[PDB]
Structure formats: C-alpha cells, structure tokens
Amino acid sequence: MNSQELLAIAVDAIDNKKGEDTISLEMKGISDMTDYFVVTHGNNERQVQAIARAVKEVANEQNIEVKRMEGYNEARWILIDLADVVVHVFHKDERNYYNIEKLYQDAPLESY
Amino acid sequence: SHMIQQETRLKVADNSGAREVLTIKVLGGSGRKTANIGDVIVCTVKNATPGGVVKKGDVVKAVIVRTKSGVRRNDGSYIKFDENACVIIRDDKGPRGTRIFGPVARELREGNFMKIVSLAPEVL
C-alpha cells in the first residue's frame, strides 16, 4: 500500500481509542524521511499508551512492521515510526509544549 | 577537525538551556573512547542561557548530531559538518528541550532518536 491508505488506517486506529484533535501533515514537499505526520493526544498516560498499541496493532493486522516505538514507557510523547507515516501520540499536557503543527505550519494539514 | 572524546567541548543544538557542554564519557558497550553521530555521551554543562531548564554545571547525556570529523554511509557517501554538536536527551532518549537547531544526520532515526529527527529543521 501507499502512505495515503496507511495514513487512513492509522487515523482509524486513533479514532478507535478516541484520539483527540487528530491531525495529519503532508510532509512530501518538506521531508525525505516520511510522507505524513500524524498528531493526536490522549487525556491520561494509559490512553496514550493504548492509542500507540492500537496504531501498532492495526498496522500489524495489515502486516506493516512498526519499526520502533519511542517513549512508550514514559507515555508523554510516544513516536510510532511506520516509516512512510510517523504517528505522534501526546499526553494532553505535553502536546502544546511541542506544537508540531506550528513547527510545520506550511505543511498541508488535515484534521478529523 | 578531530574526533569526539573525553574533555572535548561541543555546542548544543537545541532550546534546552545548554549552550556548550564538556564531554566526560562516551557511552557504548564497546568501551571505546571515540564518539560520532548517533553516539550518546555524558557531559557537564559549561555554558547555559539564562532562563533555560538546563543550567551550568549539570551533568547530562547528549546524542551527537553533527561531527566535523564526519562518518561514511553505506552509500559510500561521506558526510561532514562545520562543527561538533549534540542534543541533550532524557533517559528514554527523548530530547530534554523542545526545539532543534541546524542540521542533524539521518542516522538518528535508526538510533531511535526519531523524535530529534522530527523536530529538526534539516536532515542530512
């Protein structure tokens, strides 16, 4: 599959665990490392860990290898590299600190 | 023009408050004393910016993100940078700061520093 339908899958998994304020950024013009950045958050450290696992699971289930999970234990910012698509899961109180959206304020943003 | 080892000074390339560190130890199971891109080091903050979270004298870990004695890719490409630079990191490898300054080498993604990659303006 192509990154667009991989994107579509990841946001479904995120919406499944009630991911808040979930957005995607098109990184094609802006980066060689990936095509999309997904940004979403949860309200507690369990929900951020669950949204991450949900992204892993629904990506396994279609046989995509989650390449790495970063900061899964601490559950503040969990980065799930699917390579074509990179999913950032943030604790509610951490998202605004990093403000990924405003760092790439010229990337095509889509919200859900 | 020379490699990174104990007692070598490095610019900090993030908003952590640290501006310049002093290496005290290269980490890594090889026990070897050279650090390059993607290596974690221990260092003491020798210069800091007022109002930052990280203050002079603190002991921190940092990942090397630019080396002026560069490394060669699987590609046969050899990349180099004009300066040595690192990024202060937490224990789980997430950046202490929230912003990265200048170019970082793409090896960080394989190092599991993909958070630093995602914040960096330029990836070489």
Give the domain CATH number at A67.
Answer: 3.30.460.10
DSSP H or E stretch at residue A15: helix A3-16
**Dist. CA A103–CA B51, nearest whole Å:** 22
Q: Looking at the complex, does the CB of residue B119 fall below 8 Å from at least one CB of chain A? A: yes
Angle at alpha carbon of residue B119, lines to A32 and A66, rounded to 5°: 65
CA distances B115 to A18, A35, B2, Å, are 23, 16, 28
Sheet (strand A85-91) strand order: A68-70, A77-81, A85-91, A36-42, A20-26, A109-111
* Residues preceding chain discontinuities in chain A with C to N over 2.5 Å: none
Which residues of chain B have a CB within 8 Å of the CB of A97?
98
How many structural domains is chain A composed of? 1
**Which one-letter amino acid corresponds to residue A46?**
R
Which burial class, exposed, middle or buried, applies to B78 when counting CB atoms under 10 A from its CB (0-12, 13-18, 19+)? Answer: exposed
Q: What is the DSSP string of A47-102?
A: HHHHHHHHHHHHHHTTT----EEESTTT-SEEEEE-SSEEEEEEEHHHHHHH-HHH
Give the residue from A94, A111, A90, A104 showing the smallest Cα distance to A34: A104
- Of B94, B117, B123, Cβ closest to residue A71: B94
Architecture per CATH, domain B1-124, reads as Beta Barrel (2.40)
Resolution (A): 2.3
Q: Do A70 and B115 touch (CB under 8 A)?
A: yes
- Boundaries of domain holding A2: 1-108
How close is the nearest chain B Cα to the Cα of A70, in Å? 7
Please give the interface size between A and B, counted as residue pairs whose CB atoms are below 8 Å apart: 40
Q: From the CA atom positions of chain B, what is the Rg in Å? A: 13
Residue of B nearest to A39 (CA): B118
| The two three-digit tokens of residue A78, written as one number | 């969990």
Beta strands A20-26 and A109-111 are antiparallel
